[PDB]
Design a protein. Sequence first.
Lengths: 617, 617
Amino acid sequence: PVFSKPMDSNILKKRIFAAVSEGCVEELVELLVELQELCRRRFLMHKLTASDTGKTCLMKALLNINPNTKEIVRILLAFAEENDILGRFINAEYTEEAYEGQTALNIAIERRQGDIAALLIAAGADVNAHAKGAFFNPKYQHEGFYFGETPLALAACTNQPEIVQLLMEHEQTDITSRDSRGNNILHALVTVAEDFKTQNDFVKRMYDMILLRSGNWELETTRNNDGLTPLQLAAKMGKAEILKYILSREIKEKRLRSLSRKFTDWAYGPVSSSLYDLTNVDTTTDNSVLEITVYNTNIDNRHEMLTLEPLHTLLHMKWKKFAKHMFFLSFCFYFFYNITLTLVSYYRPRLQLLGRMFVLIWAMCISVKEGIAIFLLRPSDLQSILSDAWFHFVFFIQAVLVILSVFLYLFAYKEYLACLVLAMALGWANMLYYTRGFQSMGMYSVMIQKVILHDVLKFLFVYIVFLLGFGVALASLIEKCPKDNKDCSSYGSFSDAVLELFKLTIGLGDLNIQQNSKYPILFLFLLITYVILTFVLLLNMLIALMGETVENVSKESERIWRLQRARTILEFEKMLPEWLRSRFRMGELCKVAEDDFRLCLRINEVKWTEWKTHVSF
Amino acid sequence: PVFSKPMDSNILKKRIFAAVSEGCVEELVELLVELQELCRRRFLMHKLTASDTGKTCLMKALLNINPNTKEIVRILLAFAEENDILGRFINAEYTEEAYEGQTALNIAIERRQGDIAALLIAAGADVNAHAKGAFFNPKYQHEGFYFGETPLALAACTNQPEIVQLLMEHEQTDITSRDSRGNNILHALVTVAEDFKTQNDFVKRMYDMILLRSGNWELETTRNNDGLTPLQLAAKMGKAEILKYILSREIKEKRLRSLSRKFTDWAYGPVSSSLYDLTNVDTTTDNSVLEITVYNTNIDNRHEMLTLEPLHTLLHMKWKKFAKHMFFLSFCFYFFYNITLTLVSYYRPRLQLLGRMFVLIWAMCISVKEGIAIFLLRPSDLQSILSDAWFHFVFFIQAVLVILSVFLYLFAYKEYLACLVLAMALGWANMLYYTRGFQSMGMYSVMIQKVILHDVLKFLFVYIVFLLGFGVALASLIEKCPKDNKDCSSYGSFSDAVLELFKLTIGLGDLNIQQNSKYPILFLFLLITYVILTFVLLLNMLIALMGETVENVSKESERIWRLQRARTILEFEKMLPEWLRSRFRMGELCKVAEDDFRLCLRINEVKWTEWKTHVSF
Ligand SMILES: CC(C)C/C=C(\C=O)C(C)C
Ligand SMILES: CC(C)C/C=C(\C=O)C(C)C
Ligand SMILES: CC(C)C/C=C(\C=O)C(C)C
Ligand SMILES: CC(C)C/C=C(\C=O)C(C)C
């Protein structure tokens, strides 16, 4: 965080700023009387405002607060009344690029002072004046303080509800005012919340106050500049507490029940048949909160908010309804394609040609989907943890290897086997993708990907360094055995010596010690020290590396597997044509409203743990 | 949980239901006067009751409670007094299949209201009216709310004891009333309890109140529809707190001491000689709580309630008395059978025939017990965790292989060795069953079964996929070496290539790189990538998989072993003939009662930790 200029720096007009900084009033009141007539003996009181910055004495007084500050603000404003410049004095604007648009009301609200803040507003302060500075609108979280760039949202982003209540009651205040980010009062509150459960979080408590007092459906429907309602913004930023509050918001009182996203129908002991609203949760529209929350648009907090009631059962009625019947079909139609690819080519000649045609019409079928899936892929997802993109190359590669091989079959480049037989080894290793449909083995394949990434690549990369150095060092010592024979040359070339070192790691071959080295002692010293760096230092410790991996993750392995399946639930859903997606939850109900455009959903909740505890008191 | 119709849906007779729903009375009292004479100008007031459902205004008023509801129920009943239809109005019944039999008293009791509930009962409410609906009687735990289908048990299943106390004092209330499940007031309380220790659990507190006020032995002896006393039902559902309370129930006061299952004889400091009752705990009868609690009829909570005092020492005096003397005999008589099977057949000819006869008369002896044990087995136990059934096939298979082999011995099909020599390898691996009699190694064999199931099968299943794909891929590249010789063909067929890959995993053989591949580079690329998927990715990680297994279980391995032994304690007991089971605990004592049919048991309890803490205050 680097800012070119500071807001307040306590390092003949300087007497104005010095007097208000230390809070001294006696040196100011008599001296302010003197200033009254400098302009007369000379309409535009420049002298009491700074030049390089727009900061005035009013901003200077409030930025350097003290118990004497209240005694200064009242007389400072009275000076502008005599010169009739209170309009320009109160609405004075900062001019630095970092802090631009900050007014005296903005600083008074920040410094936890409802006394002067009410006084300035009553004096004609510019309510809903936007602080459109680079500092107030940081490019990241740590580059500044973003709060919505309005005095109302600043009091809302801070924990001062009294100044909020005063600002709501003001007539000139524009509630549905959008700042330079296209945000709102509710968008700003969503950004400043946190996903970590805090005992005393005012954001969801103040979300209720601002929304209810507005009492209409325009704050929750106003779109962002990127294009995002306050509902969807909480999903993009991963705000679970706000998402749980918004999706399950029930208003008991009349005249405001239209602001409810969940209308409980009936309750009887543990079971209650709540009737939720999903007018912006189902994937019928674009950028749904369900679609946003399952992809890697949220960070480090997905399952704790993918289990929320309106959308936890949205996936179950998508899996148990059409996704399960298409995972088997994808499993069967790929198992048969792999079996046919193996069968018709293991029996290759050194009428079953209709089976070979099936591989032709299906390798193109896989690659046309993978080819179009690569285009929708982005580098922001290609290298990540929950990418689900590595399976998009290897499905494409195994498909593109088959069609490339057969193009060289009839054309007879003799390389038709160099590409086809690599598809068998990859095609059968691709069969492990379709094990997500089982909990016991789907969690197992989750462990494999974490093991193959955190530990195996780190072991191999060190290993080739010990294989390149020791391969060259061992092969360099060996002269050419006489008689021009291939004997004496187990370590004769770099490729021959590296291969013999690799066979030493697994445990295959004979460890000869008289391999025609011109230093027999040095060759053995370099041999009985290679196996203590790999077999004793690395291979045993490789087993040790993965123990930290399978102990920290095993309590989250069942959590990551569900997110894999929940992604394929809607990845399958987008493949259905528009006429096929005519099967949805339920019709329009829950309210007369605007002629009932409320796509509701009835899910009964039988909760035994809470009800048992509730009656226990 | 899916219900076709809702109980209460707040989405010219509709004015009746609307007025009571919102609690408005002014719009009802004058309008109810109007209704009085619609039927006259027209015995059967249909108009104020619903048609598709039996719900009336009384049910509608109580389902939509409000502070004005008490002001509505009193005048609503007075309307039926004038028409003299209070009998049909109060006893009005629901008619939906989901919710059937629900009355106005049932809803009033549910909504924590003892005021109206007492008023309805005083008005002639149908006490002990059964709500025999599909919702009130769910097929599972999450399909509804089961509470015993009576107003008394509903107040008991909820935490309202005042309405219970009122219902006990009523004359018309039938305490020993059985619902559609054959349950009782005490059966229903057992079902709604929980095995997790809760600080404030009313169920065992309300079990005391209902049983004592009844003051007789008919609630604890009334059989279920499945056939189960309230004692045995707590064992089937795994209710440890109720089981600990019931089995150790001591009533101090006279006239009710006959309702005690434990009569403490004397106490002196730490040692107290409690004298328990096991009239339904010992295995003398069928479906004993001891027999039920040791088999896999309880779930996830067995050792925390198999250690309860009446039945923790019931097994110790069965092990130290006849079970230990039959485990050695089973160990010796099977060790000798295995030794004889090995000895008389390792020396097979390429008079000791009496030893061969012993295997004949004992292989049939094993298979006749295993054959009859398979019939008593069920698929509900065949595939489980604490099955103790896998040892029933392999004991049967090893027994059936011996008799099958000798049938081909004299008959001379020459296959007599193909079945007999497989019995040695299985017969000696069966010798590890009889290691349950030792703590150090019995816990070891518990680890093996968990390791062999959670980890080894998951590793092998992935391994054959990498062996099928790489076996075909390696064998496909190899042409037939000239001269029609068997050289050049280490990977010549599928079986030859798969075998050479398996030997690569363990570490046997020579890793040749010039194995007559028509692509020497591609064969090596497919070879130095198979060993990084098994030897580097799988075999090392296999060791890693079992580390989560031996760290989470080792604190429970000593717990599962006891349940294995406790099952064989009564598995041995059922083998004794009726005359042999003439040795039991102790006679009839502890009370005069009904001519003393109380099979008691005296077990002295020397408790030093509690007594030391008790005197410390
Ligand atoms: C390209 C062939 C060598 C198969 C490659 C793999 C599968 O075995 C990788 C993905 C592990
Ligand atoms: C043997 C390979 C194919 C396993 C590696 C993966 C597949 O599961 C990726 C996803 C890490
Ligand atoms: C049938 C023979 C091969 C013995 C089989 C086993 C014992 O070694 C299995 C039970 C592990
Ligand atoms: C070598 C085998 C016989 C071990 C496996 C078992 C026996 O202990 C079953 C019970 C898992």
